[PDB]
Design a protein around this ligand. Structure first.
Ligand SMILES: CC(C)(O)[C@@H]1[C@H]2CCCC[C@H]2CN1c1ncnc2[nH]ccc12
Length: 167
């Protein structure tokens, strides 16, 4: 039993809700919140900018030190950093950006990072400003993640389309 509330069950391990991941995180304080990051951990907009803003820029300050020490992430890769006031940990995951010419097959590699965590609150990777089809992202998520994932879909119209089209 966990404290996630109001989710629709899609599969044995995947759940979905029309909600802002930032608001879900503030309320639940999950062990892991996933950020839809880029390789530079530059949290400008979308999920990343919204999470970072909610931490009063502490996520960005921590991230800049991470990059100065370790260099950029790989597309498809991840790192675990603090969740600040929103969660115990933030798993920063980089899905491919099709606007940058990055390979969509890397979306599966990105979701594989979720399997290192028993329970996660997450957005659909590569959706929104990353330019990929959110329906496809949900399919890859369901077919790749085996741990328990709670997906927050910020756009209500998109949520309804995802549920109604889900096979
Ligand atoms: C596709 C996805 C991941 O569901 C959505 C999608 C909704 C409309 C705009 C573009 C995307 C933003 N993203 C978010 N998801 C959850 N929480 C969020 N907080 C702020 C942004 C945000």
């Amino acid at each position: 039993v966990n404290s996630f509330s109001g989710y629709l069950k899609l599969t044995d391990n995947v759940y979905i809700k029309n909600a802002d991941i930032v608001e879900e995180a503030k309320k639940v304080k999950p062990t892991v919140v996933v950020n839809a990051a880029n390789v530079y951990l530059k949290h400008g907009g979308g999920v990343a900018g919204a999470l970072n803003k909610a931490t009063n820029n502490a996520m960005q300050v921590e991230s800049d030190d991470y990059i100065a020490t370790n260099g950029p992430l790989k597309v498809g890769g991840s790192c675990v950093l603090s969740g600040h006031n929103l969660a115990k940990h933030c798993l920063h995951v980089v899905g491919p950006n099709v606007n940058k010419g990055e390979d969509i097959q890397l979306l599966k590699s990105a979701y594989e990072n979720f399997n290192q965590h028993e329970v996660l609150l997450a957005p659909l990777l590569s959706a929104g400003i990353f330019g990929a089809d959110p329906i496809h992202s949900l399919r890859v998520c369901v077919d790749t993640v085996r741990t328990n994932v709670y997906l927050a879909v910020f756009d209500k119209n998109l949520y309804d389309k995802l549920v109604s089209s889900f096979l």
